[PDB]
Design a protein around this ligand. Structure first.
Ligand SMILES: O=S(=O)(O)c1cccc2cccc(Nc3ccccc3)c12
Ligand SMILES: O=S(=O)(O)c1cccc2cccc(Nc3ccccc3)c12
Ligand SMILES: O=S(=O)(O)c1cccc2cccc(Nc3ccccc3)c12
Ligand SMILES: O=S(=O)(O)c1cccc2cccc(Nc3ccccc3)c12
Ligand SMILES: O=S(=O)(O)c1cccc2cccc(Nc3ccccc3)c12
Ligand SMILES: O=S(=O)(O)c1cccc2cccc(Nc3ccccc3)c12
Length: 151
């Protein structure tokens, strides 16, 4: 099954600053801010498209998922990535593809996302899986946003 969700939100942080923290410095900041995330390790690449990362978390059980950069562009505040594989990843998911873009709005940012869940089999995406992936996505982003506001 393919399950696509599009949403907009806002931040009081302007986009160059918010993009730098969430995307350019996201690999170093995320484990500093989210206690459960132990490490973000680059498996392949340079931080450009095609870069593969291993994200390790404690959910006392340690597990991991893999991220791939699909697109990244500082001038357009664009970051598209796919989460797939690993011991930490929901059994029912093949992958989740994220497309994220910021734009300047009202001294802060507008945030535009598209999230595509790919499930095994032909059943609806379970509400619990949608809720869990949205809560993790929001939690990381909002923890980084709070850190920027506190600096
Ligand atoms: O971490 S390891 O235990 O080898 C490992 C264990 C299990 C699955 C892995 C998948 C991709 C990369 C790894 N290692 C990796 C390679 C380069 C940098 C960081 C991690 C994986
Ligand atoms: O070999 S590694 O260098 O970690 C490695 C390097 C690059 C990519 C990898 C992907 C999956 C597993 C690995 N390692 C692995 C870990 C434990 C058992 C078997 C393989 C990967
Ligand atoms: O990769 S993260 O950026 O943390 C992440 C970000 C956004 C959504 C995620 C959904 C499932 C698992 C993740 N990580 C995870 C990693 C290791 C173990 C268990 C879950 C998600
Ligand atoms: O088969 S999965 O269940 O995803 C899986 C489960 C557990 C550990 C995995 C480690 C590396 C790649 C996988 N799959 C993969 C292969 C290519 C791209 C992305 C992920 C792993
Ligand atoms: O939740 S939102 O406010 O759109 C959101 C806010 C801020 C950052 C986000 C990053 C990735 C995905 C989101 N949304 C999303 C939508 C559906 C499923 C999973 C994540 C993000
Ligand atoms: O700390 S846990 O939730 O265990 C966690 C476990 C594994 C992976 C996680 C990835 C992102 C955010 C988390 N925490 C989080 C914190 C507050 C709100 C939303 C998500 C992750």
């Amino acid at each position: 099954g393919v399950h696509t969700f599009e949403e907009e939100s806002t931040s009081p942080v302007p986009p160059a600053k918010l993009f730098k923290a969430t995307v350019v410095d996201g690999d170093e900041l995320t484990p500093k801010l989210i206690p459960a995330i132990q490490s973000i390790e680059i498996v392949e690449g340079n931080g450009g498209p095609g870069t593969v990362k291993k994200v390790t978390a404690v959910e006392g059980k340690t597990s991991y998922v893999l991220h791939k950069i699909d697109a990244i562009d500082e001038a357009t505040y664009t970051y598209d990535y796919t989460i797939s594989g690993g011991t930490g990843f929901q059994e029912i998911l093949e992958k989740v593809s994220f497309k994220t873009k910021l734009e300047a709005a009202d001294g802060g940012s507008k945030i535009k996302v598209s999230v595509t869940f790919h499930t095994k089999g032909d059943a609806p995406l379970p509400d619990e899986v949608h809720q869990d992936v949205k809560q993790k996505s929001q939690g990381i982003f909002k923890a980084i946003e709070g850190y920027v506001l506190s600096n």
